């Protein structure tokens, strides 16, 4: 039942984001209300999380493949739908496996950003 409900919620959110894309392209993201903004952000994160590198795609991509489990996927998607990962950077879900890898990539991105900002301030 958890799998079914998560799938249905994901489909509804993606459909709503697809519908709202047209308004975004006509009136701008600012015109949308806060609820629509949250839905848009969550939908983009879901879209980027659905991406998954393959162990046979090393030559095409240049990165190690990932194997994900059904329970891990369901739990991660449920958390994302509930909003447990709103503060996470959007790009962290791109070309990754589970939520653990997502958090590791977010940590790496934060560390690199802090180092780059420190260098810029030093300049």
């Amino acid at each position: 039942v958890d799998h079914y409900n998560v799938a249905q919620d994901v489909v509804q959110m993606l459909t709503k984001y697809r519908e709202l894309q047209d308004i975004i392209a006509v009136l701008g993201i600012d015109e949308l209300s806060e609820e629509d903004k949250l839905i848009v952000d969550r939908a983009r994160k879901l879209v980027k999380f659905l991406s998954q590198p393959f162990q046979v795609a090393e030559v095409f991509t240049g990165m190690t493949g990932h194997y994900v489990q059904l329970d891990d996927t369901i739990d991660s998607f449920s958390g994302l739908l509930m909003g447990t990962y709103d503060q996470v950077p959007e790009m962290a879900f791109y070309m990754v496996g589970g939520i653990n890898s997502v958090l590791e990539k977010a940590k790496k991105m934060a560390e690199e950003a802090a180092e780059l900002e420190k260098m810029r301030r030093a300049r």
Partner: peptide, 30 residues
């Protein structure tokens, strides 16, 4: 008052989330 009187993968994920949030806050502070 009576209720007060009476009385690891998730933990790892929570720790990682806390660490990432702390890193974001630290870079904001910087």
């Amino acid at each position: 008052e009576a209720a007060e009187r009476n009385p690891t993968g998730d933990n790892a994920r929570d720790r990682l989330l806390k660490e990432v949030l702390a890193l974001q806050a630290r870079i904001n502070q910087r």
